């Protein structure tokens, strides 16, 4: 029956870390027998589940995430790991028990001026509740005088934009990251 993983890994365009796109997979069989048959060229990282038992297991749910992040930021997308990107863009819960894949895309995410179309939120009043997608784009304040929209001195549009020129380092390059998170689906 072939559930779509041929678009969660072959789509031309994703969105940013503040706009991490979901894919709700159900009612279907997904041919797992090629995704780990690809000499996991993509960087492949499972928590709790194992690469030898994807065929013989069943689930209520398979939520399939997708976001694009800078190179050194793939440390964040795992339970227990803290810092700015988890605190402000994408929090994982500690008892999340799925598998994470990421791979490099200097192709399709980089001109010589670099794509500035990929955003990231610096700031918010609190750290995230896990798995809370936040499309909030208000003007952040953290001081004694929260004004209306007068920029300067902590009145920022917190969704600043990365640069992704292909002369950057590997820790800065754009990474194409997918979380395979997890009553029908088997193999």
């Amino acid at each position, epitope marked *: 029956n072939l559930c779509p993983f041929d678009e969660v890994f072959n789509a031309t365009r994703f969105a940013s870390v503040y706009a991490w796109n979901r894919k709700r997979i159900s009612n279907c069989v997904a041919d797992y027998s090629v995704l780990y048959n690809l*000499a996991p060229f993509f960087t492949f990282k499972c928590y709790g589940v194992s690469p030898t038992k994807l065929n013989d297991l069943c689930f209520t749910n398979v939520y399939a995430d997708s976001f694009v992040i800078r190179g050194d930021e793939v440390r964040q997308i795992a339970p227990g790991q803290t810092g700015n990107i988890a605190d402000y863009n994408y929090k994982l819960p500690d008892d999340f028990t799925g598998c994470v894949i990421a791979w490099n895309s200097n192709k399709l995410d980089s001109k010589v001026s670099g794509n500035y179309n990929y955003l990231y939120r610096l700031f918010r009043k609190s750290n995230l509740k896990p798995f809370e997608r936040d499309i909030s784009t208000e003007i952040y304040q953290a001081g004694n005088k929260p004004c209306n929209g007068v920029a300067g001195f902590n009145c920022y549009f917190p969704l600043r934009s990365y640069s992704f020129r292909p002369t950057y*380092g*590997v820790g800065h390059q754009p990474y194409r990251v997918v979380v395979l998170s997890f009553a029908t689906v088997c193999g």
Partner: antibody, heavy 125, light 106 residues
Framework: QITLKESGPTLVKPKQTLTLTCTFSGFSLKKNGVGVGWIRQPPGKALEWLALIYWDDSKRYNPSLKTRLTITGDTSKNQVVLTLTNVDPVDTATYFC??????????????????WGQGTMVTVS | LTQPPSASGTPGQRVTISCSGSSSNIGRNTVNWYQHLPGTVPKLLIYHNNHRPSGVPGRFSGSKSGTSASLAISGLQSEDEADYYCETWDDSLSGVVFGAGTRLTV
């Protein structure tokens, strides 16, 4: 289990083209997130870096050497081949093909050479 | 980049290594370190920062205070009579820029 095996001619007259090679083992360059390096060693001076082959033929060279260094990696033949022309006695060195990942299985960027080849004492005379 | 040519130390005291460069590479990207015995192969000693692979003593650590990469030696002994190299990818230079080398005497 990862091993960089390198070979090539070492007894080479000055100023023609030197082609070298390094057969990499223990991994594949069909992997993405992986580079393979080339490193100068002037004995008793320093190291300098030459070039990186990335999996999608992403092309990097040392800004001192643009035209005299062009680089190719044949993943099918499980090797990376180093090409360089018009070769000076200062280019007498030992060259290191080395493995540059970014995996670090708990997923921290490496951006570094973790495994190296032994080296070839390249001589220009 | 910029790296002092050598450093000295008796076998055991806290010995500092320094490295520096511009804001494009070391001031932005992440720093590496290497140990190279004379005549033999070099090897990685610290990658990205402060984190080491299998086979490295945990006493040696780094810091990225802007444009400064600071390898540390504590507990010196005999084996590490070697050239210590800082590299970092450069954004403008589009490549790998090594340090100048630093040999530590025991």
């Amino acid at each position: 289990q990862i091993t960089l095996k390198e070979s090539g001619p070492t007894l080479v007259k000055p100023k023609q083209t030197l082609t070298l090679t390094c057969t990499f083992s223990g991994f594949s360059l069909k992997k993405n997130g992986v580079g393979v390096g080339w490193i100068r060693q002037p004995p008793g001076k320093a190291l300098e870096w030459l070039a990186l082959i990335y999996w999608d033929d992403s092309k990097r060279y040392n800004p001192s050497l643009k035209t005299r260094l062009t680089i190719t990696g044949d993943t099918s033949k499980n090797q990376v081949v180093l090409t360089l022309t018009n070769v000076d006695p200062v280019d007498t060195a030992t060259y290191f093909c080395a493995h540059r990942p970014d995996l670090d299985s708990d997923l921290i960027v490496v951006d570094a050479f973790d495994m190296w080849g032994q080296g070839t004492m390249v001589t220009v005379s | 980049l910029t790296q002092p040519p050598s450093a000295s130390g008796t076998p055991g005291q806290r010995v500092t290594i320094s490295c520096s460069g511009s804001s494009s590479n070391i001031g932005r990207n992440t720093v590496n370190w290497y140990q190279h015995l004379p005549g033999t192969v070099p090897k990685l000693l610290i990658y990205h920062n402060n984190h080491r692979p299998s086979g490295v003593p945990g006493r040696f650590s780094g810091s990225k205070s802007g444009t400064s990469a600071s390898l540390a030696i504590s507990g010196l002994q005999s084996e590490d009579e070697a050239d210590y190299y800082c590299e970092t990818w450069d954004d403008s230079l589009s490549g790998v820029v090594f340090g100048a080398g630093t040999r530590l005497t025991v």
